[PDB]
Structure 1
């Protein structure tokens, strides 16, 4: 009887009254999936939420997302009735239903009361990372698709291919603040993996500002002067001047060199019109020197990061906001977009292919002669076409670097190619030297269906013409990448599965333990120059003991000191190269770690809390890149041999030899 209730025991599942049906199982009530069925796949289905398609909305402030009016009604009714009878503008809640039944304007104003400062949380289905769960403020958009702030999509790693988001609603007081707290977009502007700004200006934004801070030889107004970036506005947004003219302006820049006060320092720069207008964007605290650069995707990356480490977060946040609007703003003001007249093939390409023909034709005759073997000529074909491609490269790249020669104080004078494709190769947005070589030049040698390399490259160029055989070689590679995504994704979740299955309950429970013990952080100088330096390993930790300088007994960093930006800069100035740092495994704290042994680095940059469970976040951030995972010695530098751990002996002719396998060759 007991058994039949549970799992029919394990004796056999005796059927029920004259029926093909085992007696009922509460085991099949306490062992289904993940134990029970809330926690199992399929438990619940979120209320106060909406799974809806997405869309841009280039005007959305960094702190707000867009929600459809129809969706709004459906999701906030209870709050709408809670309001309609807490105040009392509705007769009854039944008549309240009848008001939304009639779509009466009154309840839409009560809808304004339940949304205009009531934040929401957002999430996508394919999301495997914590950076895919964020919060914004709602904005009543009449439509059907959830809009967003453009650049945040890169965080969710969500393009516009059918990303249906389930936007959640923090009902309780707690969750509402928690949204605007840690889950606010404007706060997790750093990656828990590395202390760098998680969002890098995409590309539309950057070409707009590439066209802002920009140098062109033909400049209208090239020489005038201004006293205010505001009248700069009145010159280009009007149309009388160019956005590139070399104007001498007085930028009275500021610097928080005081105890929090931005010191006044006057200065005039040989800047371009757009950079003056870029100052209207750049907050005083941030200096004009960093923004007197052509602005690339990587430049603008560290650009936002400096504004943070120096001036702060608030400036940076509303600054990047400014950037977004003006990034796309002058992207329009850009005009120049694409040119067929730019994609010119040099008659040097056709010339080297002529050589690349005659050459292997002779090398094939060396085969009909028996000098080079099939295999030696196999790699030989590889050999000269490689050289041939690099020579054609040496042509198409210089063509696309100095060829824009417009008149100015003479007959002609060069400037960096104004050729749009090159602009994407300068801003480094989405046009790289290899992609360029693959449209306007010979692709190169490709992988064969076996995985090895076919001796013959893709002869011509895609921009012009090839045939299906050349195509089959290329089809391999394309289909290659495809297969990869298709499998990697599933195993990543399963990887983080076993990962959470091992770390979940690890919580930081103390701050300081009571031990000097830590481990050794070292730059893994292997092969050539260091692969992974000293600084980035120390970034966000605490020195084990009172560390000395090469000068003995001169402590450059006392035992318990948090090593952040400035101290990392400090450990890069000193000659110290090996730093013992307190480790999370050497932590004296049992059943947890101390704030010190951990550090500060996360989305935050402050001391890790007592209550912050590092266990789970460790898991996800190591499994986040899961989807991503797949002769003589003559150095070309200048140093000096410092033989280590080896007995070297002089022989005849005064030369030197090595008597062991343990041999590191240093380059002091």
Structure 2
């Protein structure tokens, strides 16, 4: 029926009035490119030779446009239509002789998409307004979209078979609006939490931390090679920090050339001992902490996520507040290029020598676990002989199992502290954890010391059989190993019964994420 012809979703009121399907829109995979500015994107030549842009003919661009119309649909930088004043849309593919075509003021050529154009780029789910920023075209050989890395944080992207769309503004008013409203250097700080969204990222952060240590000296050739990559260099070579016995520059001395203008900032490094501001050496800092950027040059301190990432009061935040939106772009690009071209001299890796513990540590960890098991046995036996006293508002099982859980937590904390206690300065796990690039301080202990204690539904492993967890135990066993305590490390490998409990914990942790996406998407749609 007629009222049936205009139903809800996919009717005529909710499926073709506000949500529809547009043209001049492409789609393909994305891959990294550290040699692009944060406001550029890389487009293949098969997409660029397909989408067009109508350009009005004026006596300022008559010769260039008739040259473009000489070559059509065969050479790449060409054109494929001429729209004269009458509305006549002629096609260059079928016209017998092109030379007769004489462009005239008022005509309108349909150009091929060339370098310097402006596009709009978004990712699959659009959550906040940073998930659709205006980029700038730059055309490259192969067939994937190429974009910088510091911009992957707003889009929430990663390069394992992802895809993104682009739309090409056709008019000139829309081009101007996109240019002065939504270009990516204009959306560095967000109004949601008044802090930057783009910071230095995965691989450049680990290297920036090592490049600004107290002892990094560069020769002459390497300093020249690094200065070759600065886009805002005035042309002068600074005087080395060590003139004799031979000239050597320092890491901070080269980094002081990247920092724009004359800004001021004071932060701390993630290993600042809290008892340093108390005694002397408050302004000396034996460990080289308390970053100090005075008058636009690094005087002291190591750089990390607390001082270059996306937090309030960072270096990028201050550079945006004081200098503007067109200098922070150069800041990002220069940091990335210089640090990558030094990293291919310094190198970085991870192996199993970084995952190997020491003899003493292995021994000590075993002892703490043996004592932890002894305590759990005491509590259980004490409860059977009915020597436990429940606490206010606690059942005996509660009181029982929560005391056992507290003992297990204390044992796990001691094992973790022991695992943390033994690392070296050359370790490559500590190098990604300290700089804040990737990882946490518990993965170190899980790889080296103890995996810990599993639990489903927020509680210990339940009795899935009748009064048992598996047919390899005796009934009503309440020990630590019989209800989920994995006492090995990922390196030393797990035993079968522990491999099963680990699978259980992982499974519940895997289901929750599957639910969360749909729930949050729907509620946000309603509210908006």
Q: TM-score, normalised by structure 2?
A: 0.69
Judge conservation of contact 1:121–1:133 (CA < 8 Å) in 2: yes
Judge conservation of contact 2:6–2:12 (CA < 8 Å) in 1: no
Determine which of 67, 74, 83 is the counterpart of 1:89. 67
Structure 1 residues 77 and 121: alpha-carbon distance in aligned structure 2, compared to 1, 3 A threshold = closer
Structure 1 residues 91 and 392: alpha-carbon distance in aligned structure 2, compared to 1, 3 A threshold = closer
Secondary structure of 1:137's partner?
strand
Residue 85 of structure 2 corresponds to residue 104 of structure 1:
no
Residue 31 of structure 2 corresponds to residue 55 of structure 1:
yes
Determine which of 354, 362, 365 is the counterpart of 2:370. 354
**Separation (CA, whole Å) in 1 of partners of 2:123 and 2:399:** 54
Larger deviation: 70-79 or 141-150? 70-79
Residue 292 of structure 2 corresponds to residue 289 of structure 1:
yes
Determine which of 46, 49, 57 is the counterpart of 2:22. 46
Alignment deviations for residues 620-659 of structure 1 (CA, whole Å, 9 cap, x no partner): xxxxxxxxxxxxxxxxxxxxxxxxxxxxxxxxxxxxxxxx
Judge conservation of contact 2:241–2:249 (CA < 8 Å) in 1: no
Determine which of 410, 413, 434 is the counterpart of 1:387. 410
For 2:490, the equivalent position in structure 1 comes to 462
Structure 1 residues 135 and 358: alpha-carbon distance in aligned structure 2, compared to 1, 3 A threshold = same
Q: CA deviation at 1:122?
A: 0.7
Secondary structure of 1:89's partner?
helix
Aligned ranges for residues 124-143 of structure 1 at < 5 Å?
Answer: 124-143=123-142
Aligned ranges for residues 110-259 of structure 1 at < 5 Å?
Answer: 114-215=113-214, 233-234=223-224
Alignment deviations for residues 579-603 of structure 1 (CA, whole Å, 9 cap, x no partner): xxxxxxxxxxxxxxxxxxxxxxxxx
**Separation (CA, whole Å) in 2 of partners of 1:183 and 1:318:** 18
Structure 1 residues 357 and 482: alpha-carbon distance in aligned structure 2, compared to 1, 3 A threshold = closer
Judge conservation of contact 2:213–2:251 (CA < 8 Å) in 1: yes
Judge conservation of contact 2:226–2:341 (CA < 8 Å) in 1: no
Aligned length: 416
For 1:443, the equivalent position in structure 2 comes to 451
Larger deviation: 277-286 or 129-138? 277-286
Alignment deviations for residues 141-164 of structure 1 (CA, whole Å, 9 cap, x no partner): 112111111111111111123321
Residue 513 of structure 2 corresponds to residue 482 of structure 1:
no
Alignment deviations for residues 248-268 of structure 1 (CA, whole Å, 9 cap, x no partner): 9669xxxxxxxxxxxxxxxxx
Secondary structure of 1:161's partner?
coil
Determine which of 315, 331, 334 is the counterpart of 1:322. 334
State the structure with bigger RCO (CA 8 A, min sep 6), 1 or 2: 2
Structure 1 residues 481 and 363: alpha-carbon distance in aligned structure 2, compared to 1, 3 A threshold = closer
**Separation (CA, whole Å) in 2 of partners of 1:125 and 1:84:** 41
For 2:47, the equivalent position in structure 1 comes to 71
Residue 452 of structure 2 corresponds to residue 452 of structure 1:
no
Structure 1 residues 80 and 143: alpha-carbon distance in aligned structure 2, compared to 1, 3 A threshold = farther
Secondary structure of 1:348's partner?
helix
Judge conservation of contact 2:122–2:166 (CA < 8 Å) in 1: yes
Q: CA deviation at 1:139?
A: 0.5
Secondary structure of 2:165's partner?
strand
Larger deviation: 298-307 or 480-489? 480-489
Q: TM-score, normalised by structure 1?
A: 0.56
Q: What is the Cα-based RMSD across aligned positions, in Å?
A: 3.7
Residue 344 of structure 2 corresponds to residue 337 of structure 1:
no
Secondary structure of 2:27's partner?
strand
Alignment deviations for residues 494-526 of structure 1 (CA, whole Å, 9 cap, x no partner): 2222222xxxxxxxxxxxxxxxxxxxxxxxxxx
Alignment deviations for residues 215-251 of structure 1 (CA, whole Å, 9 cap, x no partner): 46xx779xxxx9xxx887159999xxxxxxxx99669
Secondary structure of 1:130's partner?
coil
Gap runs ≥5 in structure 1? 1-6, 8-24, 239-246, 252-270, 405-416, 501-668
Judge conservation of contact 1:80–1:114 (CA < 8 Å) in 2: no
**Separation (CA, whole Å) in 2 of partners of 1:235 and 1:183:** 36
Alignment deviations for residues 108-162 of structure 1 (CA, whole Å, 9 cap, x no partner): 9999974222211111222232211011110011121111111111111111233
For 1:630, the equivalent position in structure 2 comes to none
Structure 1 residues 209 and 444: alpha-carbon distance in aligned structure 2, compared to 1, 3 A threshold = same
